[PDB]
Write a protein that binds this ligand. Sequence first.
Ligand SMILES: Nc1ncnc2c1ncn2[C@@H]1O[C@H](COP(=O)(O)OP(=O)(O)OP(=O)(O)O)[C@@H](O)[C@H]1O
Ligand SMILES: [Mg+2]
Lengths: 170, 157, 105, 529
Amino acid sequence: AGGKRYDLFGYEVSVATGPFIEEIKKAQFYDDAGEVIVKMNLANTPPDLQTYNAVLERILNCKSKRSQPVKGENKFAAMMDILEEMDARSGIKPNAESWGYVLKELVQAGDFRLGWVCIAGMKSLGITPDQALVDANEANAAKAKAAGTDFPAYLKKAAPESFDTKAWGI
Amino acid sequence: DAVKFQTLYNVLTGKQHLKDQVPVKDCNLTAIFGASWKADLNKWFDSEYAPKLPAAERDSAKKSLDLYLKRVDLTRYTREELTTYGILACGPGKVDALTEKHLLETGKARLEELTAGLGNKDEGVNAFRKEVEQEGKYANWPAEKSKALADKVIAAS
Amino acid sequence: RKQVEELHKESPLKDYKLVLETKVDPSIGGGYILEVCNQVVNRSAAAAAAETAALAKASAAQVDWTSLPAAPPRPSPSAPDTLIRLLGSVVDDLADADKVEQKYG
Amino acid sequence: LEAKQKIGFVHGIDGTIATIAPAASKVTVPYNTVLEIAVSATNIANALVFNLEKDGSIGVILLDNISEVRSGQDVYATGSLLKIPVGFHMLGKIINPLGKEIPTGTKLGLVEEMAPNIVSRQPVNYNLLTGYKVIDTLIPVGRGQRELILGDRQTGKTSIALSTILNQTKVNNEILSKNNVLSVYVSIGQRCSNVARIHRLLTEYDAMKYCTIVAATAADPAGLQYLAPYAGTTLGEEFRNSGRHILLVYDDLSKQAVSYRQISLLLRRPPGREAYPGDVFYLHSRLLERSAMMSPQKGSGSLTSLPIVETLSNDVTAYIVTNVISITDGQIYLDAKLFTGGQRPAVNIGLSVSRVGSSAQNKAMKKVGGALKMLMGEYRKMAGEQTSGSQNVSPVMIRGARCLQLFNQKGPSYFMDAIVALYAVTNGYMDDVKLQYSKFYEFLLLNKDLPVLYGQVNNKYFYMYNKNLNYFIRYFGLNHEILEPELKKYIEIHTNLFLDNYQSRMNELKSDEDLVQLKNLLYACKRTV
Ligand SMILES: Nc1ncnc2c1ncn2[C@@H]1O[C@H](COP(=O)(O)OP(=O)(O)OP(=O)(O)O)[C@@H](O)[C@H]1O
Ligand SMILES: [Mg+2]
C-alpha cells in the first residue's frame, strides 16, 4: 500500500519492516538494534526513516552498547554515524524527529557547544528546535560559564617559558 | 590442577618469575587462583610432593612453605599502612595487635572527625556506618564483620 | 564379523564375494583394526588411550596459569566539576601518575 | 560407525611436498581436496591434492607433521575441500592457517571460494582513514577497495597498515559494531619476532580487540605460506555474509609467489617467466577479486584489502609487481630515494594513485582534495627550482612546502586533526610563519589552544578540545554557513597569536644549546604530530 522501492540494480525490494522495528524497540542494548538492521538488510528489507528514528530512540534510551562495558563509548558518535549512513550511503535524509533525538542526547550530556551546532544545523536545514531543549542548552551554558567549566582546566594553565620536549609533554 | 599447583610451588620457592613485570602478592595470586589457596596447596603438597622425595628435603620444603605462606600473609597489607602507621615496626608476631590498634584508633579518629564536622552524634554514627559498610563492600569484606567493628569502635569511643 | 559384513553392505559394492584375512600386531594388545573395500576403522588401545590423553593434555595446555587475566575494562573518567574546581591543574598530573602506577605498579 | 577411507600409501616425499601411490584402481580422489596421512597411531598429517597423473599417482601438498612422514604410511581421504573455523571468537588471536591457535607471552568456512559476481556487490561509497594525509586527501582509500603497497625494504609498507589498524580502533570503539571495520593481518613467510612485536604493539595500543593475525612464518611450510592469504579471505567471508566491515593486510606476496614457485617446481610443473609457473596472475586474481563492497541485498558488508609487495631498486617492471599492479585498484608507492631523502611516509605521488576518488572520501574531504590536487600539480612544475625569489615565491610554492611539512609524520593523524590543519594551508593563513615551525604550529592548534589560553575566546562552539566536532565536519562540510566563519575566526587568531608570541621567541634563539633543544623539539613534533 505504498510506493514500491528498488535497489541500485533495479531489483524489486521488500517493505515489510515492522517485524524488525518491533525487535529494535524490544531490544535492550543498542548494538543488538544494529545487528537487527543487518539481519533486516540481508533479507532485502532496507531501513526506512521511521526505522532509523526507532533505532535512534533505542540508542538514546539504552544504557550501554553491549552487556559488558566498553572503553571509548560515545553515545553521540553512533547516532551521527547512523546519520552519515543515512545521508551519504542510503540517500535518505533525517527529519525534525531525528535531530530531536540527537539534541536530547547533547542536552543530557551537557555539551552546549555541540548543542549550539545542532541548533544552528536545524535552522540551516529549516528544522526548528524545541525551546524546552534550547533553554536547557542555555542553562548548561550559563552553569559552565559561572562555574568556569566553559573550557577544560588543562588549557587554562601557563605554558613552558623555555622550549623543552619534556616540558611541553611529548 | 597439578600444573597450577606446581607453578605455584615454583613461584613460592622462587625458581620461576611470573609471566610479566608483575609482583607476587596474596591479592595478585589469589586473583588468578580459585580462592582455595592455602588448603589446596598444603593438600597437594602432602599428597603428591612429600612422599616422592626423602624426608630430609621434605622437612626443609615444608618449613620453607610455611615461611612463604606467613610471608604472603604479611604481604597482604599495603606498604604505606605497613611502614608509616607502624604495623610491622615491632615485628611479625605483633603485626596482628598493631593492626587491631591502628584500626580502632583510626576508627575513633574518623568518628571524631565526623562529629566535629557535622555534630548530631546519631547522624555522625550513621554516616560512619555507611562509610564503613561501603568500604567493606569495596574491599570484599563481610558486612556483618563491618557492623560489629563499627559497633565496637562506637562502644570504645 | 557382524561389523565386517555390515561395512561390506554399506560399501558401494556388495555383489562381489568377500574374502577375509586376519593378522597379528605385536604393537597392539587391545582392540582391532578392520579394513573392507578400502575403508579402514581403527579401534585400538594405542589410539583410544592416546586420544583420551591428548584431550587432557590439550585442556591443560589451553590455559596460561603463569600469565595474568584481563581485568575488566575501564570506561571514561568523566571527572566532576566540584573536584575540578578544587583541583584545576593537578588532575592531569594525578591521572598521569595513575597511568604510571597502572603500568608499572 | 566412522570408518576412514584410504586411497593409497606414501610413495615419495620431497621436503614440503609428497607423491602418493594409489592402492586400488577404482578408487578415485577429487581435486583440491584435503587428504590425511596416518604418520602415527596417534597423530595425523593433513594435506591437499594439487596434481593428478596418468599413473594414478597424486601430487600432494603437506601442511603438518612433515618430519614424521615415511614411505609406506597409510594415506586417507576426507573427500571435502579445505575448511577452517571462522567467527567472532577468533578475533584477538594469532592463528595457524590450519585453524590452530598460536600461544603468545562449530562453523567452518571453505578456503577457496568464488568471488562476488557483478550483481552481488555495490560500488565504493565510504572511506577508510589510514591516518596519513597523503592517503586521506590525494590517494583516497575506501571500503571494498583493494590497493597495493609498493616499496623497497624497510620503508614503511608494514607501518602504513599498522597505522591504519591503530587509527581505526578509536573510531570503532565509538561507532556501532555494524559500521566498525575490523582487521586481519596475514604474515606470509615473515619472521616470528616481527610477528611478536606486532602483537605487542597492537596489545599496547589496544588494537587487538579488532584484529586477528594469520601467521605463516618463514620456517613454516611453503604450502602453509601458500594457503595463509586464503585463510584470511576465508575469515573475510563471514564478515561479508554478516554485512560487517573488515580489512585485510597481506604481508609480502613476493614470498607467497616464491612459495608457489617452490611448490609447483618441486611438483614438476613447467616454469615460465622468472621461473614462475605462469598462472600466478590467476592466483593473485582469485585471491584479490574476492575483495568487494557487497550489495545491500547482501547486507552492504565489505572487505578492504591492502596487499604489500617488496620492490628491488625502485623498479615497477618485475613480473609479480606488474601482475599485481594489473589486479589492484590503486597503489601506495614508497620510494627509497625519499625515505633516504628524509620524508616519512616516503610516498611518491607521481606513481601512487587511487581509482575511486571523490566517491570514497568525505564531503568535507572532497572540497579539500580537489584543491590539493591542483595545488600539488602546480607545485610539481615549480618545486624543481632552487628558491631564488625568496619573497617572490608563489603562494603555491608556499602552501605546497607547508603541506609537505604536514605530510611528514610518524604515526596516524585524526581526521579532525588533519582537516583543520590543511584548511589554514589551502587558505593561506599559514604563510607568514617559516617552513620549519609548521608542525609545532599544528601541535599548538591541536593540544595547546592559544585563544583559549590568552583569553581571546569569541567563537561560540568551534574549539579543538572537544574532539566531537569531527562528525559535524564530516556530515555538514567545511563550505557551510554555520561552520565557515567560526573556522576562520579560530584560525586567524591562532595564526596571529603564534606569529606574535612564539615565532618571535623562536627567531630570538642564538645559542647552540637552545638551538639544538628547539631542533629536537621540532623533530619530536614532526614525529608525534
Ligand atoms: N613514518 C615513519 N616515521 C618514522 N619511522 C618510520 C616511519 N615509517 C617506517 N619507519 C621505520 O622504518 C623501520 C621499518 O618499518 P617497517 O617495519 O614498516 O618496514 P617494512 O615495510 O615492514 O619492511 P620489512 O617488512 O622488510 O621490515 C622501522 O624502524 C620504522 O620505525
Ligand atoms: Mg614490511
